[PDB]
Design an enzyme around this catalytic site. Structure first.
Site, mmCIF file in Angstrom:
data_model
loop_
_atom_site.group_PDB
_atom_site.id
_atom_site.type_symbol
_atom_site.label_atom_id
_atom_site.label_comp_id
_atom_site.label_asym_id
_atom_site.label_seq_id
_atom_site.Cartn_x
_atom_site.Cartn_y
_atom_site.Cartn_z
ATOM 1 N N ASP A 1 -4.595 3.139 -5.228
ATOM 2 C CA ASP A 1 -3.383 3.897 -4.900
ATOM 3 C C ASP A 1 -3.514 5.418 -4.901
ATOM 4 O O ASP A 1 -3.449 6.068 -5.955
ATOM 5 C CB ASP A 1 -2.319 3.431 -5.916
ATOM 6 C CG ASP A 1 -0.957 4.041 -5.701
ATOM 7 O OD1 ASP A 1 -0.751 4.727 -4.706
ATOM 8 O OD2 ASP A 1 -0.083 3.800 -6.546
ATOM 9 N N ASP B 1 -0.384 7.959 1.081
ATOM 10 C CA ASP B 1 -0.118 6.989 0.018
ATOM 11 C C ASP B 1 -0.570 5.563 0.316
ATOM 12 O O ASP B 1 0.110 4.820 1.020
ATOM 13 C CB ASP B 1 1.380 7.002 -0.330
ATOM 14 C CG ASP B 1 1.727 6.048 -1.468
ATOM 15 O OD1 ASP B 1 0.823 5.711 -2.234
ATOM 16 O OD2 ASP B 1 2.895 5.668 -1.595
HETATM 17 C C1 LIG Z 1 4.962 12.524 -10.981
HETATM 18 C C2 LIG Z 1 5.171 12.493 -9.461
HETATM 19 C C3 LIG Z 1 4.314 11.433 -8.770
HETATM 20 N N1 LIG Z 1 2.961 11.484 -9.316
HETATM 21 C C4 LIG Z 1 2.199 12.724 -9.209
HETATM 22 C C5 LIG Z 1 1.774 12.974 -7.742
HETATM 23 C C6 LIG Z 1 1.119 11.751 -7.066
HETATM 24 C C7 LIG Z 1 2.338 10.451 -9.942
HETATM 25 O O1 LIG Z 1 1.208 10.586 -10.379
HETATM 26 C C8 LIG Z 1 3.032 9.165 -10.073
HETATM 27 C C9 LIG Z 1 3.246 8.593 -11.363
HETATM 28 C C10 LIG Z 1 3.893 7.335 -11.484
HETATM 29 C C11 LIG Z 1 4.119 6.748 -12.818
HETATM 30 C C12 LIG Z 1 4.324 6.632 -10.317
HETATM 31 C C13 LIG Z 1 4.104 7.193 -9.026
HETATM 32 C C14 LIG Z 1 4.561 6.472 -7.837
HETATM 33 O O2 LIG Z 1 5.541 5.738 -7.850
HETATM 34 N N2 LIG Z 1 3.818 6.683 -6.719
HETATM 35 C C15 LIG Z 1 4.185 6.037 -5.439
HETATM 36 C C16 LIG Z 1 4.196 7.092 -4.315
HETATM 37 C C17 LIG Z 1 4.959 8.323 -4.751
HETATM 38 C C18 LIG Z 1 6.325 8.207 -5.141
HETATM 39 C C19 LIG Z 1 7.045 9.362 -5.554
HETATM 40 F F1 LIG Z 1 8.322 9.254 -5.920
HETATM 41 C C20 LIG Z 1 6.412 10.632 -5.580
HETATM 42 C C21 LIG Z 1 5.054 10.752 -5.192
HETATM 43 F F2 LIG Z 1 4.471 11.951 -5.219
HETATM 44 C C22 LIG Z 1 4.320 9.598 -4.777
HETATM 45 C C23 LIG Z 1 3.236 4.879 -5.047
HETATM 46 O O3 LIG Z 1 3.654 4.328 -3.784
HETATM 47 C C24 LIG Z 1 3.195 3.762 -6.103
HETATM 48 C C25 LIG Z 1 4.497 2.966 -6.250
HETATM 49 C C26 LIG Z 1 4.012 1.576 -6.684
HETATM 50 O O4 LIG Z 1 4.521 0.578 -5.817
HETATM 51 C C27 LIG Z 1 5.925 0.477 -5.984
HETATM 52 C C28 LIG Z 1 6.607 0.390 -4.626
HETATM 53 C C29 LIG Z 1 8.028 0.417 -4.564
HETATM 54 C C30 LIG Z 1 8.690 0.337 -3.304
HETATM 55 C C31 LIG Z 1 7.929 0.228 -2.105
HETATM 56 C C32 LIG Z 1 6.508 0.199 -2.163
HETATM 57 C C33 LIG Z 1 5.846 0.279 -3.421
HETATM 58 C C34 LIG Z 1 2.486 1.588 -6.519
HETATM 59 N N3 LIG Z 1 2.168 2.778 -5.705
HETATM 60 C C35 LIG Z 1 3.461 8.454 -8.904
#
Ligand SMILES: CCCN(CCC)C(=O)c1cc(C)cc(C(=O)N[C@@H](Cc2cc(F)cc(F)c2)[C@H](O)[C@H]2C[C@@H](OCc3ccccc3)CN2)c1
Length: 390
Positions: A232, A36
């Site tokens: 990202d 990530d």
């Molecule tokens: C639908 C499941 C997730 N999938 C599909 C698989 C990738 C996605 O496509 C998807 C869709 C959305 C709308 C958001 C995220 C997401 O949050 N993704 C997270 C990582 C992650 C979290 C999670 F719960 C599960 C995961 F599989 C991966 C990233 O770090 C974002 C957060 C933001 O920075 C915020 C932040 C907050 C605290 C600390 C650091 C940064 C910018 N980068 C992922």
């Protein structure tokens, strides 16, 4: 290619994430870890969970050190709570080194773990500024660099298959490469173009122009980076600021107007299907994102195909149709250049030189008529004004 030991070390897919094998503790405990670039915490499941078939067992590690501190990380998607500690960490298909790193042992989570993703933890590769609880919790990659001779640079080749991978196939398929400490030249074609990392927190970049089939989206460039633009790997979709999303969808609809798609499709919620092999790639436009170059007044562009922004999904009937979901969605937190965008390119996170490089991926999906591209240079003025300031 000079890093054969790290080539092909990734598995996964855009919809569930790309992961690398890692070991934690003594004796080593093997775990699959989500790569990530969008966060900065190294965290692993450390307690039974319905979606985990394995987890970090601290009591079995002789090298486990308890930090006696709790940690909470709320992402955009899900969240987890854990207990901080340190332990010895290695990457089997990586640099032949072992480092002592901070590890958040996940004890509770909500909408974090993904059923069938085959990963049990997350490797936040971004900067300490966004690490929880605060910037004093050194990120894994910072530890790696400080403790070894590994160059302060990593590169990602995320490989989408271009078609659905069932559960057995995605476990046996190579999903890409994470080259730790270098650039492997076999992973890309053409030249690498670099854009400045605007600030070291997320991997923040500045987009200066957007085109849909060569047509300028024509928005004040500051809109493209409102309130930030990041690279990202931990987000599936290309996510765009509300106003930019509205403009882009209107333009993509206009370009593909020979076929009408349901609103559910454009909302990224419902799949669209075509008879096997008949996907009309040509009616969909290419999307070009121009990025600030390293030379004053100079920019370059990365061009993606619908083979990148249309994500392969299995038909709800498992039929023989080729089906996809629209992988571009609205954001309230700025542009997110997610995995579907990264799948078209070899991306170099050159921390040492505070820059991110892009080159056409040797594994990007395309057709006989069009290919993804990384092209430059273009004379671009006042690019600093494209960056957003709170
Ligand atoms: C639908 C499941 C997730 N999938 C599909 C698989 C990738 C996605 O496509 C998807 C869709 C959305 C709308 C958001 C995220 C997401 O949050 N993704 C997270 C990582 C992650 C979290 C999670 F719960 C599960 C995961 F599989 C991966 C990233 O770090 C974002 C957060 C933001 O920075 C915020 C932040 C907050 C605290 C600390 C650091 C940064 C910018 N980068 C992922």
């Amino acid at each position: 290619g000079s890093f054969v030991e790290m080539v092909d070390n990734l598995r996964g897919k855009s919809g569930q994430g790309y992961y690398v094998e890692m070991t934690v503790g003594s004796p080593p405990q093997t775990l699959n870890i989500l790569v990530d670039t969008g966060s900065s915490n190294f965290a692993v499941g450390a307690a039974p969970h319905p979606f985990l078939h394995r987890y970090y067992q601290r009591q079995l590690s002789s090298t486990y050190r308890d930090l006696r501190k709790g940690v909470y990380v709320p992402y955009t998607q899900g969240k987890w709570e854990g207990e901080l500690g340190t332990d010895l960490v290695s990457i089997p298909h990586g640099p032949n080194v072992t480092v002592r790193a901070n590890i958040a042992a996940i004890t509770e989570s909500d909408k974090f773990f993904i059923n069938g993703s085959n990963w049990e933890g997350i490797l936040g590769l971004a900067y300490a500024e966004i690490a929880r609880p605060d910037d004093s919790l050194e990120p894994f990659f910072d530890s790696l660099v400080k403790q070894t001779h590994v160059p302060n640079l990593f590169s990602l080749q995320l490989c989408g298959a271009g078609f659905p991978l069932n559960q057995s196939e995605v476990l046996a398929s190579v999903g890409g490469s994470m080259i730790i400490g270098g650039i492997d030249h076999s992973l890309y074609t053409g030249s690498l173009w670099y854009t400045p990392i605007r600030r070291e927190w997320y991997y923040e970049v500045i987009i200066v122009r957007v085109e849909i089939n060569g047509q300028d989206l024509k928005m004040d460039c500051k809109e493209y980076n409102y309130d930030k633009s990041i690279v990202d790997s931990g987000t599936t979709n290309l996510r765009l600021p509300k106003k930019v999303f509205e403009a882009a969808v209107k333009s993509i609809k206009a370009a593909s107007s020979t076929e009408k798609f349901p609103d559910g499709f454009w909302l990224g919620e419902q799949l669209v299907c075509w008879q096997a092999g008949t996907t009309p790639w040509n009616i969909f436009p290419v999307i070009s994102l121009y990025l600030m170059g390293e030379v004053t007044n100079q920019s370059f562009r990365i061009t993606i195909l619908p083979q990148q922004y249309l994500r392969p999904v299995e038909d709800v009937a498992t039929s023989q149709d080729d089906c996809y979901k629209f992988a571009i969605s609205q954001s309230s937190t700025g542009t997110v250049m997610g995995a579907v965008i990264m799948e078209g390119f070899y991306v170099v996170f050159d921390r040492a030189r505070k820059r991110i490089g892009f080159a056409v991926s040797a594994c990007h999906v395309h057709d006989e008529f069009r290919t993804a591209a990384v092209e430059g240079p273009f004379v671009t003025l006042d690019m600093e004004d494209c960056g957003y300031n709170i």
